Amino acid sequence: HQPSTYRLFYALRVPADITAPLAEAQAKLRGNWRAVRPDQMHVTLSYLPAVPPERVEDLKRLGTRLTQDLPPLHVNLRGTGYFPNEGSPRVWFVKTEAEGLTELAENLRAGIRELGIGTDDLAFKAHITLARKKGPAPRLPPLIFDQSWTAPGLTLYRSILRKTGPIYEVQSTFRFRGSASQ
């Protein structure tokens, strides 16, 4: 076997006042849809499938540097949608929007690449995944949300696989220490 690696990802945590209405939307799921647990809900910015543990400190330094001059981000829930855009949906999600969020994700992805650490990302489209499936299920009706929250920091998570599903462990958090007026 080769040296062990970690599955890591940078994400925004989703607070209780947001996971609760999202979970209420999941009551509509039927069939082969598998709901994401509220504890598992997050806004992923980059996924790193195989990080050698000796590289984690570089990733922590990158998280601190990129968040130092941003204010806490104001994240808005928008409407629901599916991945893939193609006919059979595998993922149901809610779109999220925030000033600065695309720029943060793209700077993060560039910084990770600069470090020579591997990513496994698709084009960035900020969202919270609500459900996954394989195979047929009744499609959900379109929903929209009006809730928002203020994200105080960016989190680096490690994913560990379990029978129930993946479990996420916080590795480090990086506070947004900046302002949008100074």
Structure description:
It is a single chain. With 182 residues, the protein is an alpha+beta fold. It has a single domain (1-182), classed as Cyclic phosphodiesterase (Cyclic Phosphodiesterase, Chain: A, Alpha-Beta Complex), CATH 3.90.1140. The chain contains 3 helices and 9 strands; from the N terminus they run E-H-E-E-H-E-E-H-E-E-E-E. The protein has helices at residues 16-26, 56-67, 101-114, and strands at residues 6-13, 34-35, 42-51, 73-83, 91-97, 127-132, 148-151, 153-161, 166-175. The strands form 2 sheets. A 5-stranded antiparallel beta sheet has the order 2-6-5-4-7, covered by helices on one side. It has a 4-stranded antiparallel beta sheet with strand order 3-1-8-9, covered by helices on one side. A hairpin with a 4-residue loop joins strand 8 and strand 9. Helix 2 (56-67) packs antiparallel against helix 3. The termini are far apart. A motif (HXTX 2) lies at residues 127-130. Hydrolyzes RNA 2',3'-cyclic phosphodiester to an RNA 2'-phosphomonoester. A motif (HXTX 1) lies at residues 42-45. Residues 14-92, 98-168 form the Phosphoesterase HXTX domain.
Overall helicity: 10-25%
**What order do the SSEs take from the amino end to the carboxyl end, as H and E?**
EHEEHEEHEEEE
* Cα-to-Cα separation, first versus last residue: 51 Å
Write out the CATH superfamily name.
Cyclic phosphodiesterase
Domains counted in the coordinates: how many?
Answer: 1
PDB class: hydrolase
Keywords: RNA repair, 2, 3 -cyclic phosphodiesterase
Assembly: monomeric
Entry title: Crystal Structure of native drCPDase
